[PDB]
């Protein structure tokens, strides 16, 4: 019952601007967004509250 699946997906050509789009900064942006998600929502609620 192991059946270690081998999804190969070998032959492909390097493509368009995804190679210039998937840089390191996506992980740091996602980390900062996860750390500062709710506090921005609190400041948006306060900006809607304080008129």
């Amino acid at each position: 019952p192991v059946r270690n699946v081998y999804k190969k997906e070998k032959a492909r050509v390097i493509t368009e601007e995804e190679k210039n789009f998937k840089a390191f900064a996506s992980l740091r942006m996602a980390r900062a967004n996860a750390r500062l998600f709710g506090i921005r929502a609190k400041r948006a609620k306060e900006a809607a509250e304080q008129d």
């Binding site: 019952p1 192991v2 059946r3 270690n4 699946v5």
Partner: protein, 103 residues
């Protein structure tokens, strides 16, 4: 008591460890017992296969082992209902059934 440049050692031998020393001198004994247990099962019990019931494809819960795969316990009653057979009828057919496993 200490000495030159060596690692600080804290062995857990202050408790009376001399009474409870379980040394595996019966390790080939247990091996022969369990061989004869499996062989006596495969002889006398049934022409059912050894390690009888069929186990599921199951992913391991971690950030560590979840890429890998595992033989689980049972076939997760919604899965068994989609397969379309009764519970104990499946247990007597040879299907391993776990009522806890969700989907």
């Amino acid at each position: 008591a200490p000495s030159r440049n060596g690692m600080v050692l804290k062995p857990h031998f202050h408790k009376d460890w001399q009474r409870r020393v379980a040394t595996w001198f019966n390790q080939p004994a247990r091996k022969i017992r369990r061989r004869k247990a499996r062989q006596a099962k495969a002889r006398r019990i049934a022409p059912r296969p050894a390690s009888g019931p069929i186990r599921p494809i199951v992913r391991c819960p971690t950030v560590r082992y979840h890429t890998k795969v595992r033989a689980g316990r049972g076939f997760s009653l919604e899965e068994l209902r989609v397969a379309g057979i009764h519970k104990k009828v499946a247990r007597t057919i040879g299907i391993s059934v776990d009522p806890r496993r969700r989907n």
